[PDB]
Amino acid sequence: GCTLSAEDKAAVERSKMIDRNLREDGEKAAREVKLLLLGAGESGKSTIVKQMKIGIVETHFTFKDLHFKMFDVGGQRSERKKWIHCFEGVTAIIFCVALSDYDLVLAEDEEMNRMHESMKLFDSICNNKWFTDTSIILFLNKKDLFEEKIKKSPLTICYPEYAGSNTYEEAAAYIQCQFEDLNKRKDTKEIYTHFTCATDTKNVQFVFDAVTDVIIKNNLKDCGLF
Amino acid sequence: GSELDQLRQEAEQLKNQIRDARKACADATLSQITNNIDPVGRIQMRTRRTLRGHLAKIYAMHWGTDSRLLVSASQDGKLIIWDSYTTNKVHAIPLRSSWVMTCAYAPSGNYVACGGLDNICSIYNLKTREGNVRVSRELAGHTGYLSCCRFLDDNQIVTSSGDTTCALWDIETGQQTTTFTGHTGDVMSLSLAPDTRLFVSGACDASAKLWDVREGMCRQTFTGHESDINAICFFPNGNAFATGSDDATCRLFDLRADQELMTYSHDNIICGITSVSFSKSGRLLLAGYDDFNCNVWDALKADRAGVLAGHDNRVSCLGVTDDGMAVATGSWDSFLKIWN
Amino acid sequence: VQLVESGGGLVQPGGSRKLSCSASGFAFSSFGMHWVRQAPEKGLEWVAYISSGSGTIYYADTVKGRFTISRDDPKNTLFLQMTSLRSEDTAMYYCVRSIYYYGSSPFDFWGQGTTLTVSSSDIVMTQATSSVPVTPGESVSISCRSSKSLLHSNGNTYLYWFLQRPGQSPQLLIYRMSNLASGVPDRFSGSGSGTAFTLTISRLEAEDVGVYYCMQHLEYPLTFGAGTKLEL
Amino acid sequence: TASIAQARKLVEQLKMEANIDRIKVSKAAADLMAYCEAHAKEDPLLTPVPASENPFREKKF
Amino acid sequence: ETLREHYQYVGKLAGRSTLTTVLFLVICSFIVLENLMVLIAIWKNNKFHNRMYFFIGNLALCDLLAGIAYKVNILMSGKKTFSLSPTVWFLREGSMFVALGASTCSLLAIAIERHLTMIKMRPYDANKRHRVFLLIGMCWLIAFTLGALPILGWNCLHNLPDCSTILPLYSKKYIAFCISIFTAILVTIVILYARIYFLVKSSSRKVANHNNSERSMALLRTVVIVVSVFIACWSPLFILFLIDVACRVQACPILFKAQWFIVLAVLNSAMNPVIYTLASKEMRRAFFRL
Ligand SMILES: CCCCCCCCc1ccc(CC[C@](N)(CO)COP(=O)(O)O)cc1
């Protein structure tokens, strides 16, 4: 206040007030979890967002004094290599795939099935340069119909090189290991796996545990203890 | 069918004729003309100011019309209008969609436009009798993420979107008055001409289109790049424009002659240009590479003349004042930096 | 946008009174607040000033240390309390609104004003002219005089030409000596370098008759000048 | 059968883009040269103005 | 002549080999050069978005001051005991107490910061800077207050029996207070480091992967190494201090070899930057990169 006038001082006061407001607003959004939701076709994204319901669709919910915020971006239909860096700082990446959708085929080509597409998308998401150390939460949805579709029809159509007992457990284990083998890091990234349940509580608790593990790992790396 | 084959043959032979026509007039190179003049000296700029206060990546900035104010957009949902002389935060506006990729300042100084990743473009009134800032008009109708938007007049704005189509609107009513279609790839940026009668827009298909505002049909097409084009601006003369692409290359294209004037690239740089802007006299091209620091190119000799290495992350936006005394460089480290 | 003031009246020589103004139609939580005192049949003078967010508070040296200004933000209300009323404290008060940022127009709304009667170094602002007879259709020019240089180091020139009409509260014509306010015609003009300043009107009408004042804002206190009268 | 309509639109655009006049690159270079040299003096970035009238010079603080 | 009488009463004056002091000076040179290198490496970087950097710098500074002060002690100390006034002697001992206190009140501060960072489930940093400066100022103030305490009232210059054998002008109550503060700091550090591992293991048990299983068993190793190295250097010196408090004058010959333990405390300044900086991936990369 040596050279400033009677009006410049009030401008400085206004700037300080704006700075204080920004500081108090920029710390109330640093305690929220940013989950980027992905999927493919009829995997069950709508059912899943209904299971934990309160361009881009933003959903906000709460669970045990923790606020989660999810970005469904399925309605973008744009080149994903031009807007994917905006989600670089997401905590986890929820991924949704239906395991009872192995015998159907896409409308684009008769040979192209609807299961290899999910594997290609997972490979394109689990090996992204912007998500080197970003965890993934894999989901298998609609397992009720999978047993009925597998008891009459063997899964040799999708996996001809699979020698199993044509049972639910072995087929599910083979699908899970094939999906998890697409991971190329195995050290920085930690892929989770789950089977959807009828009740919402199991899925919500699984997401809570996964994000808690990710948060604690990030904290351990933050404080130089590891 | 025979009709499809003959139509494809006709299109191919028109393409050949257009290539021959554009090659016929390419008689001399731009190097032979500017290689005799005195090169500009090394451009030593220092960070006079430092505009801290953002708490997220910075995606767009636009210099004001009086060359004293500027507006910056962040991913924390903040639009901030500063005072560049004394580092005063003149206004702070909270947004509804935090995923904004562009912003614009009205030439009169009364309105500010913002939008991105939401298919909607919002206009905000600065000179309000209530003393606050409020939204005055929301424009919707695009099916892709908004890339750029520029004010044509007090009641006219033109926006490019990720749905390969651009649109010129009417703020009073809110309905599109012109729709520009013909792009194959995603449109990433537009720039209004000084005379405010034409504009160029570059797309992810490595092509740019110069349009006509009054009529509303594609007038000229420019090609020659190899990847996505992330920045476009006119020369201050108004009869040229420079594009910057992801293959570590900028190019200068003239409107009268549809060839390539010069290319700006270097072997040691393998990064993509994120922003392009000119100086008041058109002798300084300031392309912001995403290799953690900006760069300064002599827009007439293709060689460098200085480096604005003061950022610790990707630089995304870059502007120049109307009278050309200051240059600002916004980056993902949430720090603006006015140079001089 | 409107300000409603209340609290004045007839008081004894011993007693404390508070003047309260309520604001509606804008964002009171971001407007600096002033008070202005005007003696009956005489000129006007500044009282106090409180900034946004109750940051700093100033006072007039005349009754410095006896006034108490308070701002209630949630209710958009301002109070000014006075305790030991002398004989000079009989006058009528305005509560102007103000916002300070680059390009703003401070001293834009003057409220209405309320009257209070008491039962029985600083740059000087003066205008030599006191009355000018005039017929509509001809230009009028008035001059205002200072005792220092009003041009600050930044480049501004703090002088606010304002207009008062009989039974009508003052309104802003010129702020920072050069620019015009909002809601007034382009008939008025003002420009003056250094110490002498002038206000000019091109084509008189029946509404321009009244008193004209100049005020300075280079530093504190805010000393007003003697008004000049235009009669029909 | 909308493909032939799209091809019609494309060939119409080709018709519109193939009927413009061009000039030698030497004149398009001389125009930029003249514009650059004419307004060089009013460009502070090219040749910095003296520090007396710089508005962004840092003060004591 | 007071110092001579005190030495005679204690017994150091009775009858009062350069390899020992040469080896001491060599160890001190080692610790000071490595601590200066660590401090200059921290100063070389400028990305202070992590609040751990200030704590590491403060610990390095405290260790450097300890090294320099004990340089002064060992150089001035051997035969200048009688020829110099008591005031320089007092300054010398006050510097020792201030310094070790800098080194040890830095570990308490860093343990507090680690325990309070690893207890709040914050997905992103809130950028709070009050705590770091508060803790640095608090530890420096505590060290300065504890170093100069005796020269403002606590001495044995007028009471021969009521002061120690290791230092004939230091009352027993001051050494008892030092013992109390040292054991309090040790217990607090142990309790702070014996909860982070429990929390991490309990959280990683719910979802069992290979990464979690190796993370738990590496955090356990890190915590055990930190605690064991911190204890193994400071424990014998304070064991000697407590036995001296229990022992009387002209009784325990071992008190004449106390120097052999002090260098061990010096050795603790030889391992703090080795563990707190070179036993973590981020700091290791930041140090070996430049
Ligand atoms: C956290 C509490 C800190 C305790 C740190 C322990 C330091 C105690 C200490 C004792 C003695 C000395 C130096 C001893 C001389 N002071 C130097 O040798 C004794 O020898 P001379 O008097 O015969 O010369 C230094 C520190």
Here the CATH number for the domain that contains residue E57 is 1.20.1070.10
Residue ranges making up the domain that contains A136: 4-226
List chain E gaps (C–N > 2.5 A) by preceding residue: 16
Nearest to A96 by CA among A172, A46, A34, A45: A45
d(CA B52, CA E61): 30
Say if ligand 1 is within 6 A of residue E178 CB: yes
Size of chain D, expressed as the number of residues it contains? 61
Q: Are B211 and B217 in contact (CB under 8 A)?
A: yes
Task: Count the domains in chain B.
Answer: 1
Question: Could you give the 3-state DSSP secondary structure of residue A13?
Answer: helix
SS (H, E, C) C138-195: CCEEEEEECCCCCECCCCCECEEEEEEECCEEEEEEEECCCEECCCCCCCEEECCCCC
Report the b/e string of E112-125 with b at 16+ CB within 10 A. bbbbebbeeebbbe
Say what angle helices E18-44 and E52-77 make with each other, to 10 degrees: 160
Q: Which residues of D touch B15 (CB under 8 A)?
A: 14
Which of E10, E21, E100, E180 to mutate to test ligand 1, by most ligand atoms within 8 A of the CB atom?
E100
Q: Are B243 and B253 in contact (CB under 8 A)?
A: yes
- DSSP-derived letter for residue B304 is E
d(CA C196, CA C149): 10
Lookup: tokens for B15: 């393409």
Say if ligand 1 is within 6 A of residue E182 CB: yes
- Strands C228-231, C131-133: pairing is parallel
Task: Count the domains in chain A.
Answer: 1
Q: Which residues of A touch E131 (CB under 8 A)?
A: none
Q: Is A75 annotated as a binding residue?
A: yes
CA angle, D12 then D17 then D20, to 5°: 135
The H or E element containing residue E108 is helix E86-117
Radius of gyration of chain B (CA): 20
Q: A9 burial class (0-12, 13-18, 19+ CB within 10 angstroms)?
A: middle
Q: Do chains B and A touch (3 or more CB pairs under 8 A)?
A: yes
Radius of gyration of chain E (CA): 21
The H or E element containing residue C85 is none
d(CA C169, CA E154): 77
CATH number at residue A138: 3.40.50.300
CATH number at residue B287: 2.130.10.10
Residue ranges making up the domain that contains B331: 2-339
Q: A213 burial class (0-12, 13-18, 19+ CB within 10 angstroms)?
A: buried
Say what angle helices E52-77 and E86-117 make with each other, to 10 degrees: 160
Q: Are B325 and B66 in contact (CB under 8 A)?
A: no
Q: Are E126 and A31 in contact (CB under 8 A)?
A: yes
Nearest to A30 by CA among E121, B43, B149, C167: E121
B13's CB contacts (< 8 A; 6+ apart) are none
Q: Is A45 annotated as a binding residue?
A: yes
- On the CB side of A20, CA atoms within 13 Å amount to 7
Task: Count the domains in chain E.
Answer: 1
Question: Could you give the 3-state DSSP secondary structure of residue E209?
Answer: coil
Q: Which residues of A touch C30 (CB under 8 A)?
A: 14
d(CA B153, CA B171): 10
Q: Looking at the DSSP assignment, which residues form a beta bridge with residue C59? A: C48
What method did the depositors use to determine the structure? cryo-EM
E33: Cα separation from own chain's centroid: 17
- Strands A67-72, C32-38: pairing is unpaired
d(CA B230, CA B245): 6
One-letter amino acid identity for E208? A
Size of chain E, expressed as the number of residues it contains? 290
C146's CB contacts (< 8 A; 6+ apart) are C123, C124, C125, C159, C195, C196, C197, C216
Q: Are E204 and A205 in contact (CB under 8 A)?
A: no
d(CA C173, CA C181): 5
Say if ligand 1 is within 6 A of residue E77 CB: yes
Which value, to the nearest 10 degrees, does the dihedral of the CA atoms of residues E141, E143, E148, E152 take?
Answer: 60
